[PDB]
Amino acid sequence: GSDLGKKLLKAARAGQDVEVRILMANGADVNATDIWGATPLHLAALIGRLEIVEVLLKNGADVNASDITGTTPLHLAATKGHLEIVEALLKYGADVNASDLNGATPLHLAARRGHLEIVEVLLKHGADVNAQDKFGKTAFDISIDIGNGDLAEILQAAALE
Amino acid sequence: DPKFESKAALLAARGPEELLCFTERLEDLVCFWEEAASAGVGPGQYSFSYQLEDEPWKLCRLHQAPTARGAVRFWCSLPTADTSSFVPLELRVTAASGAPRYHRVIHINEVVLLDAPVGLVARLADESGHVVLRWLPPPETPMTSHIRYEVDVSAGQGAGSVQRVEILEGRTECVLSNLRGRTRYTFAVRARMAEPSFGGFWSAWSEPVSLLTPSDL
C-alpha cells in the first residue's frame, strides 16, 4: 500500500470529489487496494457517486477489478440500483459476465432486488441469461423466488432470442 | 427489548432484503438482516466485519434470533466505543466460506430512530382561549437541540386527527389557537433527528394526554 493510495480509498469511500482528484493529481495509485482488495472504483460505485466513478475511469481505474469476494464495481452498482453507474462502467469495457465467489453475475444481483431497468441494460451488452450461480440458480430462478412476474416475463423473452 | 422488536419490524417493512442499521441514543448501533435461513446455518456461518474512518477492520459478534415464522434474524450490536458519528462506517456481511452477502457504507448520524418523547403535559395558556403543550425529549438522548417534533390533535372515539403541527428544532412546547370549546381533545407527540446534520424516520408516538376545553368567550 501507499500513503497516497490509502488516502484515495478513504476519499473515494467518503464521497469527497475534490479530494479524489487532488490525490491522484499528486500521484496516487488509482488501482490501490484495501485488505479486502477493493479499489476506489468499488467504493465510488458502492456509495453511488457517478461523478467520482467517471473521473476514476478517466484516470485509468481497472473496470474489471474484483475484490477478494469476487465482486466487481459492476456487481455493487447492479445491487444498489445505480443505473447511470452501471451504464458508465459498461462504456469503459466492464465485464458483464463476471462472477463472484457465489457464482453470481451482475444479472443475478440486480434481479434479486428487482432493478428492472438495469436487467435490460445488462442483457443488451451480452449478459448470459443461462448463467447459474453456486446454488444452481439462473437469473430466471431468482425472479421466481422473489416473484416479479414483470421481471420474469422479461428474461424468458430474452432466453428465447 | 419489546420496543426494539417493533423498531426492527418498521425498518424491515421499509426494506426487507437489504442490511438495516439504526441508532437509538447516538451511542449505539444495531445492524440486522432477516433471511429465510435453513435449519443448518447458524450465527457462526457468517462474518460481520466493519471499519471506522481510521480504526482497523474488526469483527462484530453475531446473534441469531427467530422472527415471524420460518425466518431467522441475524444482528450485530457494535461496541459503544466504535459508535462515532459523522464519519464513514463500512460494513461487510461475508459467509465464513468467503462468499459475499452484503456491503454497505453508512453514517450513524443518518440512521437515527429515536424513542417516543415522554412527560407530555397539557394546560391552558396564560392568554385566554389557547392550550399549551409541553413535553420532554426521549430520555437519555444527547443533542436535544437537533430533535424535531410533530404533535397530533385527536377528537372523540371513532374519529380524530384534527390537526398536525410540526415543531421546530429544540423547541419542546406548542400553542394552539383554533380549538373548539367544551370538547375533549387528545394529544400525542413523536420525535426525529433534524436534517441535514442528521437523518432517519419518525419515532413511536408518545403516551397520549387528554384535555377538555373551557367555554368560548
Swiss-Prot record, chain B:
Q: What is the effect of changing F86Y?
A: 8-fold reduction in EPO binding
PTM details? On EPO stimulation, phosphorylated on C-terminal tyrosine residues by JAK2. The phosphotyrosine motifs are also recruitment sites for several SH2-containing proteins and adapter proteins which mediate cell proliferation. Ubiquitinated by the ECS(SOCS2) complex following ligand-binding and phosphorylation by JAK2, leading to its degradation by the proteasome. Regulation by the ECS(SOCS2) complex acts as a negative feedback loop of erythropoietin-mediated signaling pathway. Ubiquitinated by NOSIP; appears to be either multi-monoubiquitinated or polyubiquitinated. Ubiquitination mediates proliferation and survival of EPO-dependent cells.
Annotated effect of mutating M143A: Little effect on EPO binding
Extracellular compartment ranges equal 1-217
- Carbohydrate-modified residues are Q45
Query: According to its UniProt record, in which tissues is this protein expressed?
Result: Erythroid cells and erythroid progenitor cells.
Mutagenesis or variant effect for R148A: Little effect on EPO binding
Kindly state the positions of the motif WSXWS motif in this protein: 202-206
The subunit field of the Swiss-Prot or TrEMBL record says: Forms homodimers on EPO stimulation. The tyrosine-phosphorylated form interacts with several SH2 domain-containing proteins including LYN, the adapter protein SH2B2, PTPN6, PTPN11, JAK2, PI3 kinases, STAT5A/B, SOCS3, CRKL. Interacts with INPP5D/SHIP1. SH2B2 binding inhibits the JAK-STAT signaling. Interacts with RHEX; this interaction occurs in a erythropoietin (EPO)-dependent manner. Interacts with ATXN2L.
Q: What does this protein do?
A: Receptor for erythropoietin, which mediates erythropoietin-induced erythroblast proliferation and differentiation. Upon EPO stimulation, EPOR dimerizes triggering the JAK2/STAT5 signaling cascade. In some cell types, can also activate STAT1 and STAT3. May also activate the LYN tyrosine kinase.
Tell me the protein's name: Erythropoietin receptor
Provide the species name.
Homo sapiens
Q: Its encoding gene is what?
A: EPOR
Q: Give the shown range, full length included.
A: 32 to 248 of 508
